[PDB]
């Protein structure tokens, strides 16, 4: 999740500290997952062949 | 633009003192929030 998050410490108590989304740093990209397609299709063919039986 | 999934929000709260209070801004996914009924609130 390529984002440098800033923790805004909000006093709403006394004591109680609320955290607000600090100004997200610059360029904007959403979370992801790089899945090795080689490892993905590997276990795919293994189980699928256990099913025509 | 190039829309945006999230929102640059702002709203009202309290602070260390009782009388005096506090507005502060945060950023929420449009999944975390929803509209209500002038701009969209």
């Amino acid at each position, epitope marked *: 999740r390529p984002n440098n998050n800033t923790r805004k410490s909000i006093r709403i108590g006394p004591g109680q500290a609320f955290y607000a989304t600090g100004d997200i740093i610059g360029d904007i990209r959403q979370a992801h997952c790089n899945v090795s397609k080689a490892t993905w299709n590997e276990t795919l063919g293994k189980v699928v062949k256990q099913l025509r039986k | 633009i*190039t829309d945006g999934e999230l929102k640059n929000c702002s709203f009202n709260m309290t602070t260390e003192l009782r009388d005096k209070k506090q507005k502060v801004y945060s950023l929420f996914y449009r999944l975390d929030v929803v509209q209500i009924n002038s701009n969209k609130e």
Partner: antibody
Amino acid sequence: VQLRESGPGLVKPSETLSLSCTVSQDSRPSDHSWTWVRQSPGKALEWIGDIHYNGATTYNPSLRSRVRIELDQSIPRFSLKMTSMTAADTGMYYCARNAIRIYGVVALGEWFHYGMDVWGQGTAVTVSS
Amino acid sequence: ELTQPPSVSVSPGQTARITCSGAPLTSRFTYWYRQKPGQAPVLIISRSSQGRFSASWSGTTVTLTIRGVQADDEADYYCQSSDTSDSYKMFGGGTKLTVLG
């Protein structure tokens, strides 16, 4: 980035026309979109189409069913094709480089447009006999 | 049809503004070019990330602001971005900048 268009510049009415643009002298080119922009004599520069090396070409609406953009990426010399020609398409034709700048990974598209920062010398194109 | 002025005027020293109006300017960033009559349209406005030349976005319009009009800058200026469907591009008119004096 030399944009050496090797072309004729003259063609007959109702037949077809082909252009080229030898892309030479470079070290980060196919990042960006290769386009063709035309200007009728003293008129508006008007977009024709562009090509992203992978084959994802795009075309100007009222032209899309006649204009084609090829890719001899081995040379590399990319080409352009127009058909059913009249004198109305006469003017200056500028090959240009629609730039793309990325911070991350292509699959999620972490890039914007920089603009057409490399316009070629151009070829004066004429339709007559 | 992108709504530009085909020409604007300014005197030796003042600043100027060219407004390219339309519909898709509430969605796509705006890029600009400088074609001195017969030259290669020079790129000047970009989105390098999400000095004397700039352009201010404003709703249906994006206003090209030019500061420091030396007579060296007399040219046709063209606004160009993209429609809302991210398929095709096209250009506006071609603003001849006049330099008085």
